[PDB]
Amino acid sequence: KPALSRRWIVDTAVALMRAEGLEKVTMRRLAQELDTGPASLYVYVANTAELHAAVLDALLGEVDLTGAEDWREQLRAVLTSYTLVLFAHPQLARSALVARPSGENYLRLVERVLELLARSGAPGAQVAWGVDKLLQDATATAAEQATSATVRALRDADEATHPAIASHMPLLVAGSAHDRLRWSFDVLVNGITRTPVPGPA
Amino acid sequence: KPALSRRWIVDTAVALMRAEGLEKVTMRRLAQELDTGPASLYVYVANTAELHAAVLDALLGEVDLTGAEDWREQLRAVLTSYTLVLFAHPQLARSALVARPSGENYLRLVERVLELLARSGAPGAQVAWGVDKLLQDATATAAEQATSATVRALRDADEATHPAIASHMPLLVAGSAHDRLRWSFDVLVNGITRTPVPGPA
Residues on chain A touching B76 (C-beta within 8 angstroms): none
Find the angle CA(A69)-CA(A71)-CA(A76) to the nearest 5 degrees. Answer: 110
Alpha-carbon distance A141 to A83, whole Å? 8
DSSP 8-state code for residue A31: H
Buried b (16+ CB within 10 A) or exposed e, B149-169: bbeebbeebeeeebebbbbbb
CB contact under 8 A, A153 and B103: yes
Alpha-carbon distance B17 to B9, whole Å? 12
Tell me how far CA of residue A179 lies from CA of A175, A183, B10, B131, in angstroms.
6, 6, 35, 16
Alpha-carbon distance A61 to A49, whole Å? 19
Distance (Å) from the C-alpha of residue B187 to the closest C-alpha of chain A? 4
For residue B49, which of B120, B98, B112, B117 has the smallest C-alpha distance? Answer: B98
Give the 3-state secondary structure of residue A151.
helix
Q: Which domain holds residue A61?
A: 1-201
First-to-last CA distance in chain B? Answer: 54
Distance (Å) from the C-alpha of residue A60 to the closest C-alpha of chain B? 15
Residues on chain A touching B98 (C-beta within 8 angstroms): 94, 143-144
CB contact under 8 A, B187 and A192: yes
Residues on chain B touching A128 (C-beta within 8 angstroms): 168, 171-172, 174
Distance (Å) from the C-alpha of residue B124 to the closest C-alpha of chain A? 6
Residue type at B187 in one-letter notation: V
Alpha-carbon distance B61 to B109, whole Å? 9
CB contact under 8 A, B149 and A190: no
- Around B182, how many Cα atoms within 13 Å sit in the side-chain half-sphere? 10
CB contact under 8 A, B94 and A97: yes
- Inter-residue contact B164 to A116 (CB < 8 Å): no
Alpha-carbon distance A12 to A148, whole Å? 36
Give the 3-state secondary structure of residue B10.
helix
Alpha-carbon distance A75 to B158, whole Å? 23
Helix (H) / strand (E) element for A175: namely none
CB contact under 8 A, A186 and B191: yes
Helices (H), chain B: 6-20, 27-33, 38-41, 48-59, 71-88, 90-98, 104-118, 124-143, 149-156, 163-167, 177-194
Find the angle CA(B119)-CA(B143)-CA(B20) to the nearest 5 degrees. Answer: 115
Alpha-carbon distance B108 to B121, whole Å? 21
Alpha-carbon distance A160 to A18, whole Å? 52
Identify the closest residue of chain A to B196 by CA–CA distance: A183
Residue type at A82 in one-letter notation: Y
Distance (Å) from the C-alpha of residue A97 to the closest C-alpha of chain B? 5
Helices (H), chain A: 6-20, 27-33, 38-41, 48-59, 71-88, 90-98, 104-118, 124-143, 149-156, 163-167, 177-194
DSSP 8-state code for residue B24: S
Alpha-carbon distance A86 to A79, whole Å? 11
Work out the number of other CB atoms within 10 angstroms of the CB of residue A16: 18
Alpha-carbon distance B171 to B183, whole Å? 13
Alpha-carbon distance A193 to A130, whole Å? 8
Distance (Å) from the C-alpha of residue B28 to the closest C-alpha of chain A? 20
How distant is the alpha carbon of residue B94 from its chain centre?
Answer: 8
> For chain B, how many structural domains are there in total?
1
Identify the closest residue of chain A to B177 by CA–CA distance: A201
- Inter-residue contact A125 to A197 (CB < 8 Å): yes
- Cis peptide bond N-terminal to B200, omega within 30: no
Residues on chain B touching A131 (C-beta within 8 angstroms): 172
Find the angle CA(B118)-CA(B119)-CA(B123) to the nearest 5 degrees. Answer: 45
Give the 3-state secondary structure of residue A57.
helix
How distant is the alpha carbon of residue B109 from its chain centre?
Answer: 11
- Inter-residue contact B72 to A121 (CB < 8 Å): no
CATH (domain of A5): 1.10.357.10
Distance (Å) from the C-alpha of residue B188 to the closest C-alpha of chain A? 6
To one decimal place, what's the resolution in Å?
A: 2.1
Report the residue numbers after which chain A has a gap, meaning the C atom sits over 2.5 angstroms from the next written residue's N, or none.
Answer: 68, 147
Alpha-carbon distance A67 to B28, whole Å? 50
Of A101, A168, A191, the CB nearest to B188: A191
Method: X-ray
For residue A180, which of B193, B129, B126 has the smallest C-alpha distance? Answer: B129
Distance (Å) from the C-alpha of residue B15 to the closest C-alpha of chain A? 23
CB contact under 8 A, A97 and B97: yes
Of A172, A186, A201, the CB nearest to B128: A172
Find the angle CA(A162)-CA(A168)-CA(A171) to the nearest 5 degrees. Answer: 135
Residues on chain B touching A109 (C-beta within 8 angstroms): none
Residue type at B45 in one-letter notation: V
Give the 3-state secondary structure of residue B2.
coil
CB contact under 8 A, B200 and A184: no
Tell me how far CA of residue B127 lies from CA of A63, A162, A184, B107, B198, in angstroms.
33, 15, 13, 16, 14
Identify the closest residue of chain A to B118 by CA–CA distance: A164
For residue B103, which of B111, B91, B115 has the smallest C-alpha distance? Answer: B111
Residues on chain A touching B111 (C-beta within 8 angstroms): 157, 162-165
CB contact under 8 A, B165 and A107: yes
